[PDB]
């Protein structure tokens, strides 16, 4: 199966540079024309660049040309997107796509935040209910930057009754909560734990949900 | 540049329904029009290429149509996993450009919200912060209203809310509501009340807790 | 430039269930120009005012038009059950919408009249076990599924129209019944307006 994997995204200062990469597998890479399509935080999709199979040339919208450089290493099956003179209108999820008459395969994307704001570790506070066949817990991931964070429960084990709320941005800091509902039987009979990963600050903290020791 | 317009930004229908999504182009693109599905987790896959041709791996219920500048996508026999946002895209001339997108909501039975309220954790209070969190989980329709009360009086300021996209599995929506004040001010009160108003009931669902009673 | 409303002025307008939809972006409009060519009987909007919709900027403007007797004005309210709102026509309840009932005057000569007024009184799905009749309420900004089996004009009041659906579509039948209203001396029409706001553009604005 055709597979596209983006890497290299991150937080960047305005005016700065960053090179994205995309690992391609499952098809003859040198045979297809490849493109980048970004999705802004506004969910707007914008074509960014495409490069020929060879590629004897490359094509850009004006809104990106002279600053971006799409390139290709057919021997090592990777696609690149060298960005420079970065703007805040460049922050978006960036997708590696296989192209031709259409973008028939998409990678999962890698994020780019172009900000002057500072990287800040998250504080993770447990949300246990105050003192039913189901019980809802939570974690409060407060004051991190930038996006994204990852939140899982018991290292992925708890996925059924889980939904993680979208982060809310306020004063250059993000905050989100995750809600997990497990039966009342395994809590607190069985350990329930939220796992917060923040790659940008390389901070990963685990928070065991302990019942509110309310004395 | 060729502009791509989708007649609507959002659409809703029942399971089994036949759904159509329309797309207008600003000039003749000669059937070079593609349709993409983006699911709530963010993953994008091609559905239809060149107006009407079914992409490999995409079920027969999906179909496309149209010519000139006016094109359509159709989903017959709506299925749960069809919850997603659908985009059109023209491939006639550079720059390649996308429609603004159409979100597909799949109708379900009315459902009242599950309401949970959490006090500030000991960790947060230690650092002088006081966030009161209220969860409003798994309800339908998506519209809902939250009202906070502190020792009986309504607090509008200092509230941060967050909504889920439609749940891919149960077709519901969920919401988070957080009231942040200072530790100094949080300790100056006793009762904090969370009221959820939803069309499922004329009386609001109420969830509260006491700071001292713990 | 110039939002063209000309398609409204020529030919025989469709019935309510197969309303014509004009979509405007990247152009300048004059609402008060078009409506003046008509004899307007009613002009009701939701989440917006009649004066405002003629003078605001949008990312998109949707203009639906069809034949509709002024006598069934009642059946345009989402307030009523009504065969019209349930099976034929339902606007977006989230964006600002206007609903306009006008009569084409003697001096508007380029519009032609239909033989009569037609609407869907019933749209349902007869399931595999030929017991369960399931009504098919029209979704907002959508056509009824019964547009495919109801003729552009209903042949005779009380006509049933059926088509068998495939197992893919879940088998069974699509079943519709149609109603007719006698044509009036001058044609009575209906206009549905919907406006949308978006990232960009300043696309749809009144011309000056
Ligand atoms: C059409 O008739 C209406 C009233 O019957 C009148 O107000 C309008 O000026 C006339 N316009 C033309 C072009 O005849």
Coordinates of N, CA, C and O in Angstrom, one line a residue, chain A residues 81-214:
Chain A
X81 N 10.5 19.9 1.6 CA 10.0 21.3 1.4 C 10.8 22.3 2.2 O 10.5 22.5 3.4
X82 N 11.8 22.9 1.6 CA 12.6 23.9 2.3 C 11.9 25.2 2.3 O 11.6 25.8 1.3
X83 N 11.6 25.6 3.5 CA 10.9 26.9 3.7 C 11.8 27.9 4.3 O 12.7 27.6 5.1
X84 N 11.7 29.2 3.9 CA 12.5 30.3 4.4 C 11.7 31.6 4.3 O 10.6 31.6 3.7
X85 N 12.1 32.6 5.1 CA 11.4 33.8 5.2 C 10.0 33.6 5.7 O 9.0 34.2 5.2
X86 N 9.8 32.6 6.6 CA 8.5 32.2 7.1 C 7.6 33.3 7.6 O 8.1 34.2 8.3
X87 N 6.3 33.2 7.3 CA 5.3 34.1 7.8 C 4.3 33.4 8.7 O 4.3 32.2 8.7
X88 N 3.5 34.2 9.4 CA 2.4 33.6 10.2 C 1.3 33.0 9.3 O 0.6 32.2 9.7
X89 N 1.3 33.5 8.1 CA 0.3 32.9 7.1 C 0.9 31.6 6.5 O 0.3 31.0 5.6
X90 N 2.0 31.1 7.1 CA 2.5 29.8 6.7 C 2.2 28.7 7.7 O 2.3 27.5 7.4
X91 N 1.7 29.1 8.9 CA 1.4 28.0 9.9 C 0.2 27.2 9.5 O -0.9 27.8 9.2
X92 N 0.4 25.9 9.4 CA -0.6 25.0 8.9 C -0.2 23.6 9.2 O 1.0 23.4 9.5
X93 N -1.1 22.6 9.1 CA -0.7 21.3 8.9 C -0.3 21.0 7.5 O -1.0 21.4 6.6
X94 N 0.9 20.5 7.3 CA 1.5 20.3 6.0 C 1.4 18.8 5.6 O 2.0 17.9 6.2
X95 N 0.8 18.5 4.4 CA 0.6 17.2 3.9 C 1.4 16.9 2.7 O 1.5 17.6 1.8
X96 N 2.1 15.7 2.8 CA 2.8 15.1 1.7 C 1.7 14.4 0.8 O 1.0 13.6 1.4
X97 N 1.6 14.7 -0.5 CA 0.6 14.0 -1.3 C 1.2 13.5 -2.6 O 2.1 14.1 -3.2
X98 N 0.7 12.4 -3.1 CA 1.1 11.9 -4.4 C 0.1 12.5 -5.4 O -1.1 12.6 -5.2
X99 N 0.7 12.9 -6.6 CA -0.1 13.7 -7.5 C -0.1 13.2 -8.9 O 0.5 12.2 -9.2
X100 N -0.7 14.0 -9.8 CA -0.9 13.6 -11.2 C -2.1 14.4 -11.7 O -1.9 15.6 -12.0
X101 N -3.2 13.7 -11.8 CA -4.5 14.4 -12.1 C -5.3 14.7 -10.9 O -6.4 15.2 -10.9
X102 N -4.7 14.3 -9.7 CA -5.3 14.4 -8.4 C -4.4 14.0 -7.3 O -3.4 13.3 -7.6
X103 N -4.7 14.4 -6.1 CA -3.9 14.0 -4.9 C -4.5 12.7 -4.4 O -5.3 12.7 -3.5
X104 N -4.0 11.5 -4.9 CA -4.7 10.3 -4.6 C -4.3 9.6 -3.3 O -5.0 8.8 -2.8
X105 N -3.1 10.1 -2.8 CA -2.7 9.6 -1.5 C -2.1 10.7 -0.6 O -1.4 11.5 -1.1
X106 N -2.5 10.7 0.7 CA -2.1 11.7 1.6 C -1.4 11.2 2.8 O -1.7 10.1 3.3
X107 N -0.4 11.9 3.3 CA 0.2 11.5 4.5 C -0.6 12.0 5.7 O -1.6 12.6 5.5
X108 N -0.2 11.7 6.9 CA -0.9 12.2 8.1 C -0.6 13.6 8.4 O -1.3 14.3 9.1
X109 N 0.4 14.2 7.8 CA 0.8 15.6 7.9 C 1.7 15.8 9.1 O 1.8 15.0 10.0
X110 N 2.4 17.0 9.0 CA 3.2 17.4 10.1 C 2.9 18.9 10.3 O 2.8 19.7 9.4
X111 N 2.9 19.4 11.6 CA 2.4 20.7 11.9 C 3.5 21.7 11.9 O 4.7 21.5 12.2
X112 N 3.1 23.0 11.5 CA 4.1 24.1 11.6 C 3.4 25.3 12.3 O 2.3 25.7 11.8
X113 N 4.0 25.7 13.3 CA 3.6 26.9 14.0 C 4.6 28.0 13.8 O 5.8 27.8 14.2
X114 N 4.3 29.1 13.2 CA 5.2 30.2 13.0 C 4.8 31.3 14.0 O 3.9 32.1 13.8
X115 N 5.5 31.4 15.1 CA 5.2 32.3 16.2 C 6.5 32.9 16.8 O 7.5 32.3 16.7
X116 N 6.3 34.1 17.4 CA 7.4 34.7 18.2 C 7.3 34.3 19.6 O 8.1 34.6 20.5
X117 N 6.2 33.5 20.0 CA 6.0 33.1 21.3 C 6.9 32.0 21.8 O 7.5 31.3 20.9
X118 N 7.1 31.8 23.1 CA 8.1 30.9 23.7 C 7.5 29.5 24.0 O 6.3 29.4 24.3
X119 N 8.3 28.5 23.8 CA 8.0 27.1 24.2 C 7.8 27.0 25.7 O 8.7 27.5 26.4
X120 N 6.7 26.4 26.1 CA 6.4 26.3 27.5 C 5.9 24.9 27.8 O 5.0 24.4 27.2
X121 N 6.4 24.3 28.9 CA 6.0 22.9 29.3 C 4.5 22.9 29.8 O 4.1 23.9 30.4
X122 N 3.8 21.8 29.6 CA 2.5 21.7 30.1 C 2.4 21.3 31.6 O 3.3 20.6 32.1
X123 N 1.5 21.8 32.3 CA 1.2 21.4 33.7 C -0.1 20.5 33.6 O -1.1 20.9 33.1
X124 N 0.1 19.3 34.1 CA -1.0 18.3 34.0 C -1.7 18.0 35.4 O -1.1 17.4 36.3
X125 N -2.9 18.5 35.5 CA -3.6 18.3 36.8 C -4.7 17.3 36.6 O -5.5 17.3 35.7
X126 N -4.8 16.4 37.6 CA -5.8 15.3 37.6 C -7.2 15.8 37.8 O -7.4 16.7 38.7
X127 N -8.2 15.3 37.1 CA -9.6 15.7 37.3 C -10.4 14.4 37.8 O -10.9 13.7 36.9
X128 N -10.4 14.3 39.1 CA -11.2 13.2 39.7 C -12.5 13.8 40.2 O -12.6 15.0 40.6
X129 N -13.6 13.0 40.1 CA -14.9 13.5 40.6 C -15.0 13.8 42.1 O -14.3 13.1 42.8
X130 N -15.7 14.8 42.5 CA -15.9 15.1 43.9 C -16.5 14.0 44.6 O -17.1 13.0 44.1
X131 N -16.5 14.1 46.0 CA -17.0 13.0 46.8 C -18.5 13.3 47.2 O -19.2 12.3 47.5
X132 N -23.2 5.2 39.6 CA -23.5 4.9 38.2 C -22.6 3.8 37.7 O -21.4 3.7 38.1
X133 N -23.0 3.1 36.7 CA -22.3 2.0 36.1 C -21.1 2.5 35.3 O -20.2 1.7 35.0
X134 N -21.1 3.8 35.1 CA -19.9 4.4 34.4 C -19.4 5.6 35.3 O -20.2 6.1 36.1
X135 N -18.1 5.9 35.2 CA -17.6 7.0 35.9 C -16.6 7.8 35.0 O -15.8 7.2 34.3
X136 N -16.7 9.1 35.0 CA -15.9 9.9 34.1 C -14.8 10.7 34.9 O -15.1 11.4 35.9
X137 N -13.6 10.5 34.4 CA -12.4 11.2 35.0 C -11.9 12.2 34.0 O -12.5 12.4 33.0
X138 N -10.7 12.8 34.3 CA -10.1 13.7 33.3 C -8.8 14.2 33.7 O -8.3 13.9 34.8
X139 N -8.1 14.9 32.8 CA -6.9 15.6 33.1 C -7.0 17.0 32.5 O -7.6 17.2 31.5
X140 N -6.3 17.9 33.2 CA -6.3 19.3 32.8 C -4.9 19.7 32.3 O -4.0 19.8 33.2
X141 N -4.7 19.7 31.0 CA -3.4 20.1 30.5 C -3.3 21.6 30.3 O -3.8 22.1 29.3
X142 N -2.7 22.3 31.2 CA -2.7 23.7 31.3 C -1.4 24.4 30.9 O -0.3 23.9 31.2
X143 N -1.5 25.4 30.1 CA -0.3 26.3 29.8 C 0.8 25.7 29.1 O 2.0 25.9 29.5
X144 N 0.6 25.1 27.9 CA 1.7 24.6 27.1 C 1.7 25.3 25.8 O 0.7 26.0 25.4
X145 N 2.9 25.3 25.1 CA 3.1 25.9 23.8 C 4.3 25.3 23.2 O 5.3 25.1 23.8
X146 N 4.2 25.0 21.9 CA 3.1 25.1 21.0 C 2.2 23.8 20.9 O 2.4 22.9 21.7
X147 N 1.3 23.8 19.9 CA 0.6 22.6 19.6 C 1.6 21.7 18.7 O 2.5 22.2 18.1
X148 N 1.4 20.4 18.7 CA 0.3 19.7 19.5 C 0.8 18.9 20.7 O 2.0 18.7 20.8
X149 N -0.1 18.5 21.6 CA 0.2 17.5 22.6 C -0.5 16.2 22.3 O -1.4 16.2 21.4
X150 N -0.1 15.1 22.9 CA -0.8 13.9 22.8 C -1.2 13.4 24.1 O -0.5 13.4 25.1
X151 N -2.5 13.0 24.2 CA -3.1 12.5 25.5 C -3.6 11.1 25.2 O -4.5 10.9 24.3
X152 N -3.2 10.1 26.0 CA -3.7 8.7 25.9 C -4.0 8.3 27.3 O -3.6 8.9 28.3
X153 N -4.7 7.1 27.4 CA -5.1 6.6 28.7 C -4.6 5.1 28.9 O -5.0 4.3 28.1
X154 N -3.8 4.9 29.9 CA -3.2 3.6 30.2 C -2.4 3.1 28.9 O -2.5 2.0 28.5
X155 N -1.7 4.1 28.4 CA -0.8 3.8 27.2 C -1.6 3.3 26.0 O -1.1 2.4 25.3
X156 N -2.8 3.8 25.8 CA -3.6 3.4 24.6 C -4.7 2.4 25.0 O -5.7 2.4 24.2
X157 N -4.5 1.7 26.0 CA -5.5 0.6 26.4 C -6.9 1.1 26.5 O -7.8 0.5 26.0
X158 N -7.1 2.2 27.2 CA -8.4 2.9 27.3 C -8.6 3.8 26.1 O -8.0 4.9 26.0
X159 N -9.5 3.4 25.1 CA -9.7 4.2 23.9 C -11.2 4.3 23.7 O -11.7 5.2 23.0
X160 N -12.0 3.4 24.2 CA -13.4 3.3 24.0 C -14.2 4.6 24.3 O -14.8 5.3 23.5
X161 N -14.1 4.9 25.6 CA -14.9 6.1 26.1 C -14.1 7.3 26.2 O -14.2 8.1 27.2
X162 N -13.2 7.5 25.3 CA -12.2 8.6 25.3 C -12.5 9.6 24.2 O -12.7 9.3 23.1
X163 N -12.6 10.9 24.6 CA -12.5 12.0 23.7 C -11.7 13.2 24.3 O -11.9 13.6 25.4
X164 N -10.7 13.6 23.5 CA -9.8 14.7 24.0 C -10.3 16.0 23.4 O -10.5 16.1 22.2
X165 N -10.6 17.0 24.3 CA -11.2 18.3 23.8 C -10.1 19.1 23.1 O -8.9 19.0 23.4
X166 N -10.5 19.8 22.0 CA -9.6 20.7 21.3 C -9.0 21.7 22.2 O -9.6 22.2 23.2
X167 N -7.7 22.0 22.0 CA -7.0 23.0 22.8 C -7.6 24.4 22.6 O -8.0 24.8 21.5
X168 N -7.6 25.2 23.7 CA -8.0 26.6 23.6 C -6.8 27.5 23.8 O -6.1 27.3 24.8
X169 N -6.6 28.4 22.9 CA -5.5 29.3 22.9 C -5.8 30.6 23.5 O -6.7 31.3 23.1
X170 N -5.1 31.0 24.6 CA -5.3 32.2 25.3 C -3.9 32.8 25.9 O -3.3 32.2 26.7
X171 N -3.6 34.0 25.5 CA -2.3 34.6 25.9 C -1.1 33.7 25.6 O -0.3 33.5 26.5
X172 N -1.0 33.3 24.4 CA 0.1 32.5 23.9 C 0.3 31.2 24.6 O 1.3 30.5 24.5
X173 N -0.8 30.7 25.3 CA -0.7 29.4 25.9 C -2.0 28.6 25.6 O -3.1 29.1 25.7
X174 N -1.8 27.3 25.4 CA -2.9 26.3 25.1 C -3.3 25.6 26.4 O -2.6 25.4 27.3
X175 N -4.6 25.3 26.4 CA -5.2 24.5 27.5 C -6.2 23.5 26.9 O -7.1 23.9 26.2
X176 N -6.1 22.2 27.3 CA -7.1 21.3 26.9 C -7.4 20.3 28.0 O -6.6 20.1 28.9
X177 N -8.5 19.6 28.0 CA -8.8 18.5 28.9 C -9.2 17.3 28.1 O -9.7 17.4 26.9
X178 N -8.9 16.1 28.7 CA -9.4 14.9 28.1 C -10.4 14.2 29.0 O -10.2 14.2 30.2
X179 N -11.4 13.6 28.5 CA -12.4 13.0 29.3 C -12.4 11.5 29.0 O -12.5 11.1 27.8
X180 N -12.3 10.7 30.0 CA -12.4 9.2 29.9 C -13.4 8.6 30.8 O -13.5 9.0 32.0
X181 N -14.3 7.8 30.3 CA -15.3 7.2 31.1 C -15.1 5.7 31.1 O -15.2 5.0 30.1
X182 N -14.9 5.2 32.4 CA -14.7 3.7 32.6 C -15.8 3.3 33.5 O -16.4 4.1 34.2
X183 N -16.1 2.0 33.5 CA -17.1 1.5 34.4 C -16.7 1.8 35.9 O -15.5 2.0 36.2
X184 N -17.7 1.9 36.8 CA -17.5 2.1 38.2 C -16.7 1.0 38.9 O -16.0 1.2 39.9
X185 N -16.9 -0.2 38.3 CA -16.2 -1.4 38.9 C -14.7 -1.2 38.9 O -14.0 -1.4 39.9
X186 N -14.1 -1.0 37.7 CA -12.6 -0.9 37.7 C -12.0 0.5 38.3 O -10.8 0.7 38.2
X187 N -12.9 1.3 38.9 CA -12.3 2.5 39.5 C -12.9 2.8 40.8 O -14.1 3.0 41.0
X188 N -12.1 2.7 41.9 CA -10.6 2.8 41.7 C -9.9 1.4 41.8 O -8.8 1.3 42.1
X189 N -10.7 0.3 41.5 CA -10.2 -1.0 41.5 C -9.0 -1.2 40.6 O -8.0 -1.9 40.9
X190 N -9.0 -0.6 39.4 CA -7.9 -0.7 38.4 C -7.3 0.7 38.1 O -8.1 1.6 37.9
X191 N -6.0 0.7 38.0 CA -5.3 2.0 37.8 C -5.6 2.6 36.4 O -5.4 2.0 35.4
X192 N -6.2 3.8 36.5 CA -6.4 4.6 35.3 C -5.5 5.8 35.2 O -5.4 6.6 36.2
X193 N -4.8 6.0 34.1 CA -3.7 7.0 34.0 C -3.7 7.7 32.7 O -3.8 7.1 31.7
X194 N -3.6 9.1 32.8 CA -3.5 9.9 31.6 C -2.0 10.1 31.2 O -1.2 10.4 32.1
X195 N -1.7 10.0 29.9 CA -0.4 10.2 29.4 C -0.2 11.4 28.5 O -0.8 11.4 27.4
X196 N 0.5 12.4 28.9 CA 0.6 13.6 28.1 C 2.0 13.8 27.6 O 3.0 13.9 28.3
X197 N 2.1 13.8 26.2 CA 3.3 14.0 25.5 C 3.4 15.3 24.8 O 2.5 15.7 24.1
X198 N 4.5 16.0 25.1 CA 4.7 17.3 24.4 C 6.0 17.4 23.7 O 7.0 17.9 24.3
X199 N 6.1 16.9 22.5 CA 7.4 16.7 21.8 C 8.2 18.0 21.6 O 9.4 18.0 21.6
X200 N 7.5 19.1 21.5 CA 8.2 20.4 21.3 C 9.1 20.8 22.5 O 10.1 21.4 22.3
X201 N 8.6 20.5 23.7 CA 9.4 20.7 24.9 C 10.0 19.5 25.4 O 10.7 19.5 26.4
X202 N 9.8 18.4 24.6 CA 10.3 17.0 25.0 C 9.8 16.7 26.4 O 10.6 16.1 27.2
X203 N 8.6 17.1 26.8 CA 8.1 16.9 28.1 C 7.0 15.8 28.0 O 6.0 16.0 27.3
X204 N 7.1 14.7 28.8 CA 6.1 13.7 28.9 C 5.9 13.4 30.3 O 6.8 12.9 31.0
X205 N 4.7 13.7 30.8 CA 4.4 13.4 32.2 C 3.2 12.5 32.3 O 2.2 12.6 31.5
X206 N 3.2 11.6 33.2 CA 2.1 10.7 33.5 C 1.3 11.2 34.7 O 2.0 11.5 35.7
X207 N 0.0 11.1 34.7 CA -0.8 11.5 35.9 C -1.8 10.4 36.1 O -2.8 10.3 35.4
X208 N -1.5 9.7 37.2 CA -2.4 8.6 37.7 C -3.7 9.3 38.3 O -3.6 10.3 39.0
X209 N -4.9 8.9 37.9 CA -6.1 9.5 38.5 C -6.4 8.8 39.8 O -6.8 7.7 39.9
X210 N -6.1 9.5 40.9 CA -6.3 9.1 42.2 C -7.6 9.7 42.7 O -7.7 10.9 42.6
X211 N -8.5 8.9 43.3 CA -9.7 9.4 43.9 C -9.4 10.6 44.9 O -8.5 10.5 45.7
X212 N -10.3 11.6 44.9 CA -10.1 12.8 45.7 C -10.0 12.5 47.1 O -11.0 12.3 47.8
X213 N -8.8 12.4 47.7 CA -8.5 12.2 49.1 C -9.1 13.3 49.9 O -8.4 14.1 50.5
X214 N -10.5 13.3 50.0 CA -11.2 14.3 50.6 C -11.5 14.1 52.1 O -12.5 13.5 52.4

